[PDB]
Structure 1
């Protein structure tokens, strides 16, 4: 009925605590219980930012409209257990003109500034992103190439095809599967793209993107070796300043 799932409590800490979480007959672990943030914390934080709330059985981000600013008590949210080979399913709903995302294989990364201080780097420069977007009203829908910034795309790299998103304010289903380097995104019960990590094709995707070695050398370095040395990392969701809702979040460990 239940499986022990380890989790970390703060930046780059070991997963030295465990949660007893439900697991169904097909292996899917329910990692959001609809009532608490147990095992969840802000990216780089030891607490859940207060702009993330629980309402009607959902994780809700309460956005103020500043895009990547992450102002107020905000920041991206992670379920603090590193996964390697897994299949994530969840429902998501985005507000009109809204933008969020589902990250996977994320690392908590810091750099050093010129004086030796730590600088926490964005989750999205280590973590591939399954885009979450109002495809009809958010201007990013029209940016990038071939609609590779629309919902369920691998952000700025591979478009969702078919682009079968339901309209804003409606519930969509996401699937993200990572299995021995093979990645599939699903949207509303259809596979909408597939790729292979750590290949020549993967490098080419990066080199064509905002994360290219020439445009963002640190991002290229992290994403080109996605998941770090052990090829694992966190699932999470994006504070891009807009109201968004997530529910029925479940993960099956595949090996």
Structure 2
């Protein structure tokens, strides 16, 4: 009753052939970060946690060197290597001034083939919807997109958080991501800030008005349009966008 087995994979596209015994509370939230280890976590596309991700004061910290999407040094996005389907995630996040990160969900590890048959690891964000994490006051992306749909807790580049009730940089915010049989809800600071439905005509329309449109990014469109792949499942994770960011109290309830 106090712990549950949680399967996890150890490397790119591998089976979940190991399990962790993780604490669960009376309401079914599984604590997936223990404050001390990266057990069950690995870099997206990797068999290890990049050293730029550290543990400090009971938090997961990304130690950013400032290159945005570049993911220079020993970086890359971080996943908890258990595919979830119907789930409610809660975590606290805090961004540095002018900082950018994100919470990914239903992510798939995706490769493509180059002209010579070599693999190319594709970005997590071309399969995974992103709950934006941002300093809404200082990061210029805050003013891009449309109707503030690149500010914190937005579905990045598609649906704005309303209300935009973020606390300013260097202050803790609470995130909720709920996916239940295609219904998706983002929460910020104990309010619901958007709601949408995967795999619908509305979902296709959102994609087509975004940077992941069929015309702008065909592979992104195809992955996202059938988000979670054949079995409508995938990873939670957090973004290396080159900036200091902290995450804590990371818990997930299986709704399935």
TM-score w.r.t. length of structure 2? 1.00
Alignment of 1:156-175 (within 5 A): 156-175=157-176
How far residue 150 of structure 1 moved from its aligned partner, in angstroms, is 0.1
How far residue 51 of structure 1 moved from its aligned partner, in angstroms, is 0.1
How far residue 3 of structure 1 moved from its aligned partner, in angstroms, is 0.1
How far residue 195 of structure 1 moved from its aligned partner, in angstroms, is 0.1
How far residue 105 of structure 1 moved from its aligned partner, in angstroms, is 0.1
How far residue 228 of structure 1 moved from its aligned partner, in angstroms, is 0.1
State the secondary structure of the residue aligned to 2:93: strand
Per-residue CA deviations over 1:150-188 (Å, capped at 9, x if unaligned) read: 000000000000000000000000000000000000000
Unaligned runs of 5+ in 1: none
Per-residue CA deviations over 1:90-145 (Å, capped at 9, x if unaligned) read: 00000000000000000000000000000000000000000000000000000000
Q: Distance in 2 between matches of 1:107 and 1:167?
A: 31
How far residue 50 of structure 1 moved from its aligned partner, in angstroms, is 0.1
How far residue 86 of structure 1 moved from its aligned partner, in angstroms, is 0.1
Q: Distance in 1 between matches of 2:39 and 2:235?
A: 15
Runs of 4+ aligned residues of structure 1 deviating over 3 Å after TM superposition are: none
State the secondary structure of the residue aligned to 1:222: helix
State the secondary structure of the residue aligned to 1:48: coil
State the secondary structure of the residue aligned to 2:136: coil
State the secondary structure of the residue aligned to 2:229: coil
Per-residue CA deviations over 1:46-74 (Å, capped at 9, x if unaligned) read: 00000000000000000000000000000
Aligned to 1:200: 201
Per-residue CA deviations over 1:184-203 (Å, capped at 9, x if unaligned) read: 00000000000000000000
Aligned to 1:75: 76
How far residue 230 of structure 1 moved from its aligned partner, in angstroms, is 0.1
Q: Distance in 2 between matches of 1:254 and 1:8?
A: 21
CA RMSD of aligned residues (A): 0.2
Q: Distance in 2 between matches of 1:138 and 1:72?
A: 22
How far residue 235 of structure 1 moved from its aligned partner, in angstroms, is 0.1
Say how many residue pairs are matched.
255
Per-residue CA deviations over 1:5-41 (Å, capped at 9, x if unaligned) read: 0000000000000000000000000000000000000
TM-score w.r.t. length of structure 1? 1.00
Q: Distance in 1 between matches of 2:67 and 2:183?
A: 34
Q: Distance in 2 between matches of 1:142 and 1:192?
A: 18
How far residue 221 of structure 1 moved from its aligned partner, in angstroms, is 0.2
How far residue 148 of structure 1 moved from its aligned partner, in angstroms, is 0.1
State the secondary structure of the residue aligned to 1:72: coil
Aligned to 1:14: 15
Aligned to 2:59: 58
State the secondary structure of the residue aligned to 2:231: coil
